[PDB]
Structure 1
């Protein structure tokens, strides 16, 4: 569940034995953890390919990607050699060999009826706080562009203490403008009008206010 710290938990990965979330957190970095059913499978492969393609967009935001399945490291690597040779993309982000699903269990990555992970995504910042969560089925690949929009929103949201409208930065109504957290007190309301008159923010109403970054 959201807002909880991330379990302090150690993982065997393709790039080494690492400590979570300490390894990313101590480096200022955030990370998007995501789980896939099984190495050497179709949909899963389309997703890995696509992440690699976008790895520098995530990374460039200070956001480290990392995958995970119940498979063992040797089939992880082998499958990644495959993507380098048949799709021609060297996979460059770490993958978790989640042994027996130690961690998957703890994170509710498993669906009803199952002993393998699903299609889960977790976004976790540099203070170890889980920020958002996604569970799609086996039968449907994710969209990393939606997962990308989200993170940017979050980054901005924290950096500027603002909310982001539906579909930001392409909101049909206020475009790429950021939303002012709606006011909750009568005195905070005077701060909204004080701001509208004099032109810092724009306001459909006292609760609905927005500005540019």
Structure 2
């Protein structure tokens, strides 16, 4: 699977029962962030679950639903989440997939070389079932959910306002929170663009490098 491809139609067993991806989310007009961990009841994966729960509402606020995955069975997931609630005080409210035959993991390249469990994969999927971004981190290094939060904010703003987002948006080191104006490919993108410029909204470093604020 690559960026731009439809997420595969698949039935998945989860701690919230059976669900049809991507449809379950797409049909509500929801994005999802699908993320793998190698094994339940590991310390890095445990800090990741803590951290994601603490951000569950920053994702959902935007119309993005977290959903986890390992090749462990659903009994493992439950026991482990009960451990996070009793010991860390955070109840897990996002579903987790029991990919217990490794079938989905395998379709999404989530299994590293010589292994039988997933790595630390991340898929952003939009309400059209389109894979918008993919991350593969290894067992030994925990993600940072604040970068995935920035990524989905960027993607949603890109869709909504037809801009591209510079390095480290919205704290880019040349134009801070200003979005780039991409080339026009539509009459409306030529009229939208021209009228932004008559409104003062556009500046530039050259003809091919123009940017505005939202």
Q: How high is the TM-score relative to the length of structure 1?
A: 0.94
Q: Does 1:136 align with 2:137?
A: yes
- Alignment deviations for residues 117-164 of structure 1 (CA, whole Å, 9 cap, x no partner): 000000000000000000011100000000000000000000010000
SS of 1:133's partner is strand
The answer on whether the counterparts of 1:182 and 1:206 sit within 8 Å (CA) in structure 2 is no
The answer on whether the counterparts of 2:72 and 2:100 sit within 8 Å (CA) in structure 1 is yes
* Distance in 2 between residues matched to 1:190 and 1:89, nearest whole Å: 50
* Distance in 2 between residues matched to 1:153 and 1:188, nearest whole Å: 19
Structure 1: runs of 5 or more not aligned: none
The answer on whether the counterparts of 1:70 and 1:97 sit within 8 Å (CA) in structure 2 is yes
| Aligned-residue offset at 1:40 | 0.5
CA RMSD of aligned residues (A): 2.4
The answer on whether the counterparts of 1:31 and 1:66 sit within 8 Å (CA) in structure 2 is yes
| Aligned-residue offset at 1:182 | 3.9
* Distance in 2 between residues matched to 1:192 and 1:57, nearest whole Å: 31
The answer on whether the counterparts of 1:66 and 1:94 sit within 8 Å (CA) in structure 2 is yes
Runs of 4+ in 1 over 3 A off after TM superposition: 182-198
Deviates more, 1:198-207 or 1:75-84: 198-207
| Aligned-residue offset at 1:100 | 1.4
The answer on whether the counterparts of 2:201 and 2:213 sit within 8 Å (CA) in structure 1 is no
Count of equivalent residues: 213
- Alignment deviations for residues 176-198 of structure 1 (CA, whole Å, 9 cap, x no partner): 11110146899999998996576
Shift in CA distance, 193/91, structure 1 to aligned 2, threshold 3 Å: closer
* Distance in 2 between residues matched to 1:205 and 1:185, nearest whole Å: 22
- Alignment deviations for residues 97-128 of structure 1 (CA, whole Å, 9 cap, x no partner): 00210110001001111110000000000000
SS of 1:100's partner is coil
